Amino acid sequence: ADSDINIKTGTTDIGSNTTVKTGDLVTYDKENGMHKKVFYSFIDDKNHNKKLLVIRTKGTIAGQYRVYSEEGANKSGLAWPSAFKVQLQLPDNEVAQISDYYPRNSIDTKEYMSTLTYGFNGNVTGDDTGKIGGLIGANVSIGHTLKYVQPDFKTILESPTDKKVGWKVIFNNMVNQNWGPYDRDSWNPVYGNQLFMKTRNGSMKAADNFLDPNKASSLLSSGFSPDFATVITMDRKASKQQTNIDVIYERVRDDYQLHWTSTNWKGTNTKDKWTDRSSERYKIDWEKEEMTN
Amino acid sequence: ADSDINIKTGTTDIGSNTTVKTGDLVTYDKENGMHKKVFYSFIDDKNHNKKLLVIRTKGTIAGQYRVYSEEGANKSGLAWPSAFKVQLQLPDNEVAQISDYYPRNSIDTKEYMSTLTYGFNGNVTGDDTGKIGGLIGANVSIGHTLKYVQPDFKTILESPTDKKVGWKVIFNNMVNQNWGPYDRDSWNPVYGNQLFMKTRNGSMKAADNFLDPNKASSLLSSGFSPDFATVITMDRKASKQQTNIDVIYERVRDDYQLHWTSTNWKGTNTKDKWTDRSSERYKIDWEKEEMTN
Amino acid sequence: ADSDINIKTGTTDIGSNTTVKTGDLVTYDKENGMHKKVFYSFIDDKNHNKKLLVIRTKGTIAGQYRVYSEEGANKSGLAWPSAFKVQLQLPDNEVAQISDYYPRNSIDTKEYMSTLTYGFNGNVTGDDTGKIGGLIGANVSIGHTLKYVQPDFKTILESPTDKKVGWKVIFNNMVNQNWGPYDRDSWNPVYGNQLFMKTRNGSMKAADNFLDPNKASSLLSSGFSPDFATVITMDRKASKQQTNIDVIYERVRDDYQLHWTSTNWKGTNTKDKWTDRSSERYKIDWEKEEMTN
Amino acid sequence: ADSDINIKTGTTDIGSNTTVKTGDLVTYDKENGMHKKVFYSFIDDKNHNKKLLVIRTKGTIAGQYRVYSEEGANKSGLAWPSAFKVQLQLPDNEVAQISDYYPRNSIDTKEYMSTLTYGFNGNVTGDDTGKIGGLIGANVSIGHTLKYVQPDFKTILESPTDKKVGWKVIFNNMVNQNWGPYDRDSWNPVYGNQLFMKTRNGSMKAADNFLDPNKASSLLSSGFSPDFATVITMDRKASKQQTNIDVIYERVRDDYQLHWTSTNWKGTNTKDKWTDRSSERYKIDWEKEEMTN
Amino acid sequence: ADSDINIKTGTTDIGSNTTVKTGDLVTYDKENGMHKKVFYSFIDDKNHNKKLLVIRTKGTIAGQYRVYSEEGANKSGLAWPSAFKVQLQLPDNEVAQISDYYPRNSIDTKEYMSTLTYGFNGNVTGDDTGKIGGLIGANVSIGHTLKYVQPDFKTILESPTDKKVGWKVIFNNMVNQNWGPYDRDSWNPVYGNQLFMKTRNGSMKAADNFLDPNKASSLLSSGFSPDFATVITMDRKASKQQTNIDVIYERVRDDYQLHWTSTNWKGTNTKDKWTDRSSERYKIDWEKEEMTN
Amino acid sequence: ADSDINIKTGTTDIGSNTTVKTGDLVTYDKENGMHKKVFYSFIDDKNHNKKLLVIRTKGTIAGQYRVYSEEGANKSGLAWPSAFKVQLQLPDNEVAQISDYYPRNSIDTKEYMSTLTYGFNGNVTGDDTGKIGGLIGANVSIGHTLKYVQPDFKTILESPTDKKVGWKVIFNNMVNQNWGPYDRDSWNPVYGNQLFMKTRNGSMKAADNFLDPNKASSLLSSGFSPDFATVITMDRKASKQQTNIDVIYERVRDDYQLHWTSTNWKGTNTKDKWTDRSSERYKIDWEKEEMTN
Ligand SMILES: CCCCCCCCCC(=O)OC[C@H](COP(=O)(O)OCC[N+](C)(C)C)OC(=O)CCCCCCCCC
Ligand SMILES: CCCCCCCCCC(=O)OC[C@H](COP(=O)(O)OCC[N+](C)(C)C)OC(=O)CCCCCCCCC
Ligand SMILES: CCCCCCCCCC(=O)OC[C@H](COP(=O)(O)OCC[N+](C)(C)C)OC(=O)CCCCCCCCC
Ligand SMILES: CCCCCCCCCC(=O)OC[C@H](COP(=O)(O)OCC[N+](C)(C)C)OC(=O)CCCCCCCCC
Ligand SMILES: CCCCCCCCCC(=O)OC[C@H](COP(=O)(O)OCC[N+](C)(C)C)OC(=O)CCCCCCCCC
Ligand SMILES: CCCCCCCCCC(=O)OC[C@H](COP(=O)(O)OCC[N+](C)(C)C)OC(=O)CCCCCCCCC
């Protein structure tokens, strides 16, 4: 908070009394279903030290959640998106540098609660025959309760070097049919990984017996639309005013297969089966303030 | 957050010191009961890279929740809106492209809570006859609690290609008569799908025995009014300054039938029975900045 | 959110650098107790496409909650407002159209919580005679908890056509004497519909035995004041610049009668007994920007 | 709160009607994986008393979470970041001084709840033989509940002297596999420190049996990006207008080793095993208002 | 709230259309580890009645939490900061006065909840021999629950006279090892004051057996940074325009000693053992609007 | 809310385009420890109807919590502030009037919750000898829960007449040693009023056995600083432009005495023992817009 040091709010920011030449580039990769788009902005504030360029890789990545293979009613497969990734890179010999990037790793908290209870009890028992009985008792109780919030997909910021910065979205865990949350490594000796399992012992065809995409999380089927910001600074006295950038939109899928053993379905997951990458190279012209490709 | 990179807030946005020519077009489709409307705005900022056009498909889609067929008191049917859809498409040969779209798939979270309890107990029992008894005990308890919020209708963003983008609204599940939430695939061996069932074993006429539309969710009967935004960019040097768009407002209904077997009502649901589509083609004139049709 | 597409906030709105000629018309209908009022505003922004007119039907509708008929102490009646309605309509041959309307159907959510508990137990029992006993036990528990918020009166938006748009307020359910919520269709074999019942088996006069209006919801007795907004657009090249509108403020009452059978009171409800409508026709003059009548 | 003393808000702040010359310097230390960056701003308000300079050490520090050594399946090690540190220092003979620093130690609160319950009980027991029995009882209960929120990593502000100021981020405790929170000093006689333990008695290779980095907290693997602000004031009449600063980005790792004793895995932690420091010296030129190096 | 009297918000404040000459003075007291700093501002609004001066004693006070003395493994001591204080004073003969001071005593609230429960019970017992038994029971329960939030350190405003005003921060109570909150006066017959005790009956060296500073509250080890505001008014017609102020940063430490009696550790606390004061005298020159020393 | 009537926000307020001459007067009453201060503002808006003057009686009142008398170890007393009061009055013959006053009586709410539970139970018992037993049971439960928040000190606004207006702060109730809240009228047959009691049956000296001021609420010891606003209007055509005001800062103390009967301490409270008043008379000069004294 800038106002917490007594500095008037907004004084230290950059971009006042200047003209910013924004832009936009959109490209669709039919092969991988990645509607990538980048929205840039050239800021050159005279009071600043270096020329600036903010790249916002909005785009969108499809889900690709479908049953790829079926072999009769005995067994069938399924491919689902294990994690989405997007990164920006620069040539090793380039002179520009990565300055900032908004979505960053943040610390996570958890509640905690301790309970202690003392008790006392006493009753008097009697019957018709005149018998009289008594009972005196006591009890103690100690309790620990711990609660926290865990999302289905967890965004991460990979260690950003000077030249390349990249994010990542992975599959934390999911709740199926209102049952206990499952994850890729979850295992049960009888049924196995029940992640995307419709019925434990249904009699339908194996390919049919898969969780309906609507029931599952949206990102699995309808894709994930990133919103990431990075800022690139280039010295104003550099001999060359042209730079090249590479943007990647890789998506990683997994193989989930359920198998009918004798009576019930058995689910197995094979992480990191396929990976799809869609890299496009853009060219930056600092002098003209336009990025084209 | 633009201010989190130290850039002055609002610097990177587009639309400053420019005149935007808005508009409006309203049309009602009596056949399907879809009061469709589009509210557009032409933004051509000199500091930007391409001409812009934002389309907000506000409109409204009716519910169409009524008992379509009745056959005596033995059985009767009912049609309800399973899902609402709206999408924008462009001709394959067009040069414009889809840039953005507001309502997007978002990650969902869930609470979690683990509990552990230790116990101790002891009592002394005595009677008139002088008998003295004792009791010492202990117990342990482990508990997992998981809570999350699930809406009745869940909006989704279908995988947006470069040329076409479309949303979708589906029926998650509903609570009937304060009873457990039901959904399309819910089944009970005795009664069956009790989704829109008034009384389990009422003696009234079959057509009468249906959940009152007021009790159910509003969207089922009174319709759903969308609010979706998309932005279309067209290069300023293109030879042709005219483009055509298509807007669709399809709505999908289901068939719900309850049947009197011997004593109680039995309910069955047949998903995706009917679909109603209302597509209108608009023409865009970038040079004059007006969309008409 | 306009700022979520990178457009500067407020750019796409209409009404900048223009003069709006507001107005006001108030009329009271003594027969039906409806203090109806409309607050209009003519907006004609040169950058827009059509002339605009926003109508805000503020007004107010009385409750009319009273004991209409009494027949000795054996039985008596009561009329209460089941639902309030207000709608705007245009002549079929008119050229203007309905564009927007603020209060719209919204999706409703519900919480959900699943619980699972394991237990263990063991005690050692002994007495004076040296007898020693043991006990080992275990238990499991499964719990589903579902919570949601339900208001007394639920506003709805009837399917809006091009020419007419109307809202509606209905009676969801009410809590009486801190007892379980009741509604119009609620029934109990012994007492019946106990909605507005003071005492189950009081000995007072039948007319007296009714819930005090203060205890009940406010809208029942003191009326409901609507706040609804609609916008009408008319093409700027139309031959005729005059339009007629109709505004209706209908209110629906129900008959609630309690009857002394032998020992306790019995309550019965007869929905949709009376309806009161108060329609006034206004005239719109686009050229002069004034609505009068 | 400035407005709480009746002073108009923002009156006492500094930075109005002045030009601030910002800047930026980025450097990457390949050896230690620390993408350090500093964003400075020279403020010289004529109404103020001294020249000002705010340094925001944004940067980023990698996680470095990996299995460094493995010796067959009997045992293997692991190094994880115990704490991240960053500090600014000035030469002892310098004339500038440290004025402020935003992230500061803050007081922490805890909930508290006391419960007291009285009880009464009575039952009548009878059998076919005509025997009649009674039971009267009472009980009391006292309960203390205390709850508070404890984050995984806890930022601290080391005692700031006049010349040097430094922050610190340490490892509070973590929740593993939904089990009770663990910390560095946690110990269990059977298993030991179960902090980063995959399975208690799994049969896999020792190196394999480690908690997946995705499951653990993000900062452990993907690094921690600091955001700390400090302000340096230098008198405007000083003979020398040049100052030197030192910025350090030390990171401390620990050694976590699990050992297979006879049947189950045993985990041991050795705090403060390695420390990595990356110090860079910057030069400040007050007269020209530029920091370079 | 100024707007609650119908006065336009901000009308009654002071500081509009005037120039405020701020300042800053920083000094570090190596002997006591108190990085004291004062940030002043001279406001002389022509519409006001007196000259104004707001002093914000930001500064910072070190924690000084360490084991001062150890005598073998039998016993050892510890000194921790019991309370931090800071006050401003004026000479008795001075003419200026204290007007305001932000952080002020505030009323504290507590929740409350009363519970009442009625019960009923009945079971039918039978065996093979045809014996039939019954049981009818009832019970009542009354419960009072009271919850409130209590911070570790509680800031107070000492009774402010005309000439001197001073704040105070004291040690409310702390939670150790997730156990019941402890305070200075807490006592246990077996162990004693268990405030900063690592293990109840550990076998390590006495000096070693102390709570790790990281586990404890931050203010204990890393110090407390105050933020207090006071405003001084001086008449504009006074003969002398020079005033002297004194600022004190006293810190009070306590002695905590744990002692090995025969088997377990015993902890004893001796409140108010040492006090450290660091007073500096500043000179105020109203005519020149500068405070120097 | 002004914007809820369609009036542009802030239109109806007073104070626009005018100059307000503020002020300040501070006086300390050594005898009673009341640092009283008044902050006035003369507003004369030409569009208004009367001259305005807002008086904000900020000031501060000391706590005066101490053991006044002790008589050996058998008994001792204590005086604590029961209630703080501040009021403004005008001479009866004056022409000015009291218009407004911010802190006003506000309605207080309470939660409420009704619970109902049905149960069922059944078990099968068997032993080695082949005996088989059964048990079928049921139970019902009704519960009322009511929760609300009650502060320690409750501010009130005494009935404001035309000439005088006064506030009041009283002692609602307090929580001692985490035990049930106590108040002035609380009584216990064995111990008595245990409000400020350290230990029930401690053996220390009577004067020593009193609750530590730090443990109690802050206002008891460190005093209460009021913040109250009132506005006085005087007609602009009045013959006399001078008015006199009286400001009072009375504080009421109570006598709390604990007495050693035979084994335990007994506490008694005598409400309204002493009262301290400090009234100062100010003179208002409307023509010159200055209040002096
Ligand atoms: C895997 C299990 C590892 C052992 C964990 C030990 C830490 C938990 C301590 C514990 O049980 O809580 C403390 C309780 C409650 O009493 P306290 O709060 O200590 O008050 C003393 C009253 N008392 C003498 C009648 C017992 O007092 C006790 O009963 C404590 C007795 C000494 C420690 C052993 C307790 C066994 C707990 C499983
Ligand atoms: C479908 C069921 C699959 C098995 C799930 C195992 C995971 C749950 C572990 C569990 O029951 O919780 C741990 C408990 C509580 O004690 P801990 O927290 O382990 O402390 C040890 C104290 N104790 C030796 C007296 C037991 O200690 C135990 O009693 C654990 C014993 C070893 C695991 C088997 C527990 C059976 C749970 C159904
Ligand atoms: C109207 C009632 C329709 C039936 C509803 C079935 C769905 C509910 C399943 C259920 O009861 O929850 C699962 C429980 C808990 O254990 P799980 O979480 O399955 O862990 C297995 C441990 N166990 C073998 C010792 C039981 O394990 C069981 O006991 C499940 C046994 C198989 C399903 C039948 C359960 C009967 C529930 C009324
Ligand atoms: C490690 C344990 C140290 C001792 C802690 C003592 C402090 C806790 C006091 C306590 O147990 O709570 C007070 C209860 C509840 O009654 P009160 O609220 O005192 O009302 C009196 C009614 N009664 C005479 C029928 C009992 O009344 C009592 O039963 C209090 C009796 C005197 C104190 C001893 C209680 C033993 C608690 C472990
Ligand atoms: C240290 C203890 C001091 C005594 C505290 C007395 C204040 C608490 C009163 C109390 O126990 O709550 C009221 C209950 C519940 O019934 P009520 O709400 O009074 O309804 C009457 C129904 N009844 C006749 C069947 C009892 O009705 C009763 O059982 C109240 C009977 C009269 C007061 C004595 C109750 C004993 C409480 C410890
Ligand atoms: C100081 C006490 C004054 C009396 C307060 C009466 C008001 C409370 C009524 C009450 O107990 O709650 C109603 C319950 C629950 O059943 P309901 O919700 O009435 O459903 C009827 C089912 N049942 C016939 C099997 C009982 O049904 C009953 O058991 C009600 C029976 C008639 C009223 C007497 C109940 C006694 C309560 C202390």
UniProtKB/Swiss-Prot annotation, chains A, B, C, D, E, F:
Disulfide bonds: none annotated. Self-assembles to first form a non-lytic oligomeric intermediate, and then, a mushroom-shaped homoheptamer structure of 100 Angstroms in length and up to 100 Angstroms in diameter. Interacts with human ADAM10; this interaction is required for toxin pore formation, disruption of focal adhesions, and hly-mediated cytotoxicity. One of its GO terms (molecular function) is toxin activity. It holds the Pfam family Leukocidin. The mushroom-shaped heptamer is composed of a cap domain (comprising 7 beta sandwiches and the amino latches of each protomer), 7 rim regions whose protruding strands may interact with the membrane bilayer, and the stem domain (52 Angstroms in length, 26 Angstroms in diameter) which forms the transmembrane pore. The keyword Secreted applies. Changing H35L: No hemolytic activity, reduced oligomerization, not toxic in mice, no effect on ADAM10 binding. Alpha-toxin binds to the membrane of eukaryotic cells (particularly red blood cells, RBC) forming pores, resulting in hemolysis, with the release of low-molecular weight molecules leading to eventual osmotic RBC lysis. Human RBCs bind much less alpha-toxin than do rabbit RBCs. Heptamer oligomerization and pore formation is required for lytic activity. Coiled coil: none annotated. The keyword Plastid does not apply. One of its GO terms (biological process) is cytolysis in another organism. It comes from the Bacteria. InterPro entries: Aerolysin/haemolysin_CS (IPR005831), Bi-component_toxin_staph (IPR003963), Leukocidin/Hemolysin_toxin (IPR016183), Leukocidin/porin_MspA_sf (IPR036435). It is found in: Secreted. This is Alpha-hemolysin. GO terms for cellular component: extracellular region. Belongs to the aerolysin family. Keywords: Cytolysis, Hemolysis, Secreted, Signal, Toxin, Virulence.
